[PDB]
Amino acid sequence: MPGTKRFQHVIETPEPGKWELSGYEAAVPITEKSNPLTQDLDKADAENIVRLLGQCDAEIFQEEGQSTYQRLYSESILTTMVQVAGKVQEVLKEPDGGLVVLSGGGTSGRMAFLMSVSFNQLMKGLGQKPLYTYLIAGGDRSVVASREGTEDSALHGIEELKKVAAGKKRVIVIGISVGLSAPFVAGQMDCCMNNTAVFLPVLVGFNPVSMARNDPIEDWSSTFRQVAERMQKMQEKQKAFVLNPAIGPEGLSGSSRMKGGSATKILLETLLLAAHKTVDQGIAASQRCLLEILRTFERAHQVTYSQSPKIATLMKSVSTSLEKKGHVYLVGWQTLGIIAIMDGVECIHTFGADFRDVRGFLIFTFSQEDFLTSILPSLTEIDTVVFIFTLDDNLTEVQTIVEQVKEKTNHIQALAHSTVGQTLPIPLKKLFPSIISITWPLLFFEYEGNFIQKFQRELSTKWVLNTVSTGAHVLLGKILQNHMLDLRISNSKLFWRALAMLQRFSGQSKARCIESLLRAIHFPQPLSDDIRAAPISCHVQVAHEKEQVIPIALLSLLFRCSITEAQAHLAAAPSVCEAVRSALA
Numbered sequence: 102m103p104g105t106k107r108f109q110h111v112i113e114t115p116e117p118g119k120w121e122l123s124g125y126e127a128a129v130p131i132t133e134k135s136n137p138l139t140q141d142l143d144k145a146d147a148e149n150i151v152r153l154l155g156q157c158d159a160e161i162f163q164e165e166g167q168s169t170y171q172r173l174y175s176e177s178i179l180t181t182m183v184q185v186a187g188k189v190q191e192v193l194k195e196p197d198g199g200l201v202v203l204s205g206g207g208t209s210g211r212m213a214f215l216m217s218v219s220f221n222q223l224m225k226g227l228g229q230k231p232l233y234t235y236l237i238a239g240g241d242r243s244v245v246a247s248r249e250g251t252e253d254s255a256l257h258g259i260e261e262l263k264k265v266a267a268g269k270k271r272v273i274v275i276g277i278s279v280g281l282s283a284p285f286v287a288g289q290m291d292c293c294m295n296n297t298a299v300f301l302p303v304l305v306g307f308n309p310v311s312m313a314r315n316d317p318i319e320d321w322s323s324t325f326r327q328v329a330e331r332m333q334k335m336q337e338k339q340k341a342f343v344l345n346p347a348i349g350p351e352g353l354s355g356s357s358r359m360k361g362g363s364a365t366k367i368l369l370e371t372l373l374l375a376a377h378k379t380v381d382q383g384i385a386a387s388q389r390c391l392l393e394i395l396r397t398f399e400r401a402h403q404v405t406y407s408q409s410p411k412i413a414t415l416m417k418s419v420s421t422s423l424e425k426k427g428h429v430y431l432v433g434w435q436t437l438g439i440i441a442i443m444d445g446v447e448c449i450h451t452f453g454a455d456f457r458d459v460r461g462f463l464i465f466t467f468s469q470e471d472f473l474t475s476i477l478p479s480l481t482e483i484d485t486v487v488f489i490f491t492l493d494d495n496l497t498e499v500q501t502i503v504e505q506v507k508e509k510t511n512h513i514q515a516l517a518h519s520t521v522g523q524t525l526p527i528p529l530k531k532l533f534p535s536i537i538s539i540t541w542p543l544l545f546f547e548y549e550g551n552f553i554q555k556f557q558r559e560l561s562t563k564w565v566l567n568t569v570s571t572g573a574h575v576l577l578g579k580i581l582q583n584h585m586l587d588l589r590i591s592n593s594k595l596f597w598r599a600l601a602m603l604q605r606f607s608g609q610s611k612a613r614c615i616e617s618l619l620r621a622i623h624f625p626q627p628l629s630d631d632i633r634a635a636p637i638s639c640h641v642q643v644a645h646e647k648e649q650v651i652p653i654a655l656l657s658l659l660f661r662c663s664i665t666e667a668q669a670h671l672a673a674a675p676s677v678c679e680a681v682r683s684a685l686a
């Protein structure tokens with residue numbers, strides 16, 4: 102029938118009480134699951150939220166139980182990390198014609214960029230030619246932009262890959278898709294498998310391959326699941342690899358910028374760093390070298406969340422500035438500045454937030470005076486300003502900007518990293534009375550830029566800002582249980598996530614949910630057969646431009662009413678959240 106080709110794969114809504122027994126829940130990919138720790142996230146206070154997310158993050162390092170899914174510390178996964186470290190090594194022995202590409206969409210794409218810089222530094226630091234590069238869905242502009250729509254073309258992914266792999270002779274392509282989901286990556290991996298003489302694909306993500314995405318891609322014949330299954334068959338001959346530990350669901354359902362982005366770093370930094378540090382000792386990489394690094398990353402979580410109360414307070418200040426109608430500026434230096442930009446930008450799509458609401462800044466890339474001349478004027482009593490630096494940064498540039506900002510703001514706080522027994526110049530550096538000082542043990546590093554210290558600090562800052570930005574919005578009532586209902590449908594995955602939320606919250610059939618959704622999207626046009634049959638991109642392109650699509654669809658369904666009736670009901674409610682929550686009641 103019209104639409105059956107498109108919606109066939111969608112599992113029917115189970116009957117009340119049978120969600121587990123239908124086998125429905127066993128088929129939700131881990132990355133889209135509701136984290137049971139965060140059932141009541143929308144009720145947690147700020148200190149709870151910090152605990153609940155610290156806990157969710159901790160699951161990255163939890164070990165496999167005794168019938169179960171492989172995790173990061175499982176032997177299958179470390180063995181795969183080892184073999185890949187090895188394959189990277191061959192390339193490092195033969196830089197001529199060699200390349201190593203790190204590729205993802207969205208936050209995977211961001212993560213790729215960072216890491217390609219770090220390992221390019223490291224090779225430059227040694228005066229070797231840089232061998233790394235990155236690819237992001239939608240080109241380089243995508244690194245610091247909210248561009249959720251660009252991940253849906255496999256041909257695009259391949260094109261980018263063709264550009265960068267020039268007339269290289271040996272290319273390692275690390276495709277990063279947390280949900281094993283992005284069409285952008287699926288095409289790169291598939292292309293690699295067709296030219297093994299040159300390419301070596303390594304796929305990274307956090308679902309078992311049996312939960313890899315399996316709906317059709319518009320410009321491609323195979324599905325992610327098929328590609329990933331074929332790569333696993335090739336692994337037995339070491340010509341592809343799949344690195345896919347379970348890290349448990351995100352604290353905000355399907356918010357893979359969080360754990361998914363973190364685990365990507367942990368996993369890839371570890372492996373590549375092992376590869377470099379063990380070539381120049383003419384020793385193979387071993388699980389023991391990897392483990393040293395992983396455990397260090399695991400400490401860094403402990404270190405990071407021991408500052409939980411200060412993190413909860415900063416969350417409260419960010420939430421107030423937004424509760425009023427102010428803005429939040431994240432001011433940081435080198436790499437941690439970039440991370441700050443990445444966080445803020447991600448709030449646009451992740452929470453429907455305007456780009457001013459939580460904005461990032463590197464010293465988007467505004468120099469010292471430039472920030473003071475341009476952005477200093479725009480500040481206000483209600484705003485918040487977060488400063489993010491190490492003690493190694495150039496603190497004369499820092500004190501200035503804070504001195505000045507102090508006057509116009511007062512809600513400032515800071516995030517400062519430091520090797521133990523560095524001191525904070527100005528004993529009056531209060532300024533920040535109750536700083537978030539993150540003091541790092543002395544670790545033994547041989548490489549020149551002390552890369553493990555960089556990685557430590559990056560990740561720790563990422564954890565802090567993610568927990569803050571995310572928590573500040575939950576506090577404003579904008580999340581439902583542990584789901585962001587009122588998202589903007591800007592790609593196919595998000596279209597599927599919406600439909601799932603309509604089934605979950607209404608309990609009504611897949612045909613009703615699909616119909617209500619397509620009516621909400623295309624209103625004031627009725628449902629023709631063409632529309633029912635249209636490719637998911639047609640729906641996305643049109644929903645992408647509208648507001649409250651999902652909440653309208655749900656109300657239509659709950660009130661068993663038309664889109665005309667549901668809209669009018671919304672506009673007659675105090676707020677979207679009250680409309681929905683009380684309709685659900």
Ligand SMILES: CC#C[C@H]1CN(S(=O)(=O)c2ccc(N)nc2)CCN1c1ccc(C(O)(C(F)(F)F)C(F)(F)F)cc1
Pocket residue numbers: 111112129130133134135280281282308312313314315316354355584593594595597598600601602603605606
């Ligand atoms: C319809 C549907 C659905 C599934 C899968 N889709 S998907 O884009 O096709 C996809 C994405 C990644 C992947 N590995 N496999 C499939 C993404 C969203 N999905 C999903 C999300 C959330 C849910 C939930 O039921 C819950 F509770 F499990 F999270 C809901 F709706 F409540 F969020 C269920 C399914």
Ligand SMILES: O=P(O)(O)OC[C@@H](O)[C@@H](O)[C@H](O)[C@@H](O)CO
Pocket residue numbers: 205206207208209249252277278279280281282283355356357358359447450451
């Ligand atoms: O890496 P994935 O699963 O392919 O997801 C890729 C992107 O959709 C994802 O990173 C998204 O941009 C983030 O906003 C999710 O919080």
